[PDB]
Amino acid sequence: KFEVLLGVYTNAIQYVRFLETALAVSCVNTEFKDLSRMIDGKIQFRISV
């Protein structure tokens, strides 16, 4: 008996981008090429009550 194979198939490793999904409504994005030189990001509010 000759053992005939019928094809070597593979899983399609799909690209999944974070901006591609709709989870990126729950944040806004910003490309930062040197994030690791930041040690401490500080934001500030002022509430005139």
Add this chain to the structure above:
Amino acid sequence: KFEVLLGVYTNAIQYVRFLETALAVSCVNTEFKDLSRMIDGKIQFRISV
């Protein structure tokens, strides 16, 4: 190395007027009234059923 200031924000105070809200439906206003010109003005109502 740096600490980053990611901006700073404040609120805008709502300039609500008594005429801007609908409570002025309940009360008729005046052009003016400079007080202490009357202590008791004694506006008197002469109705007749």
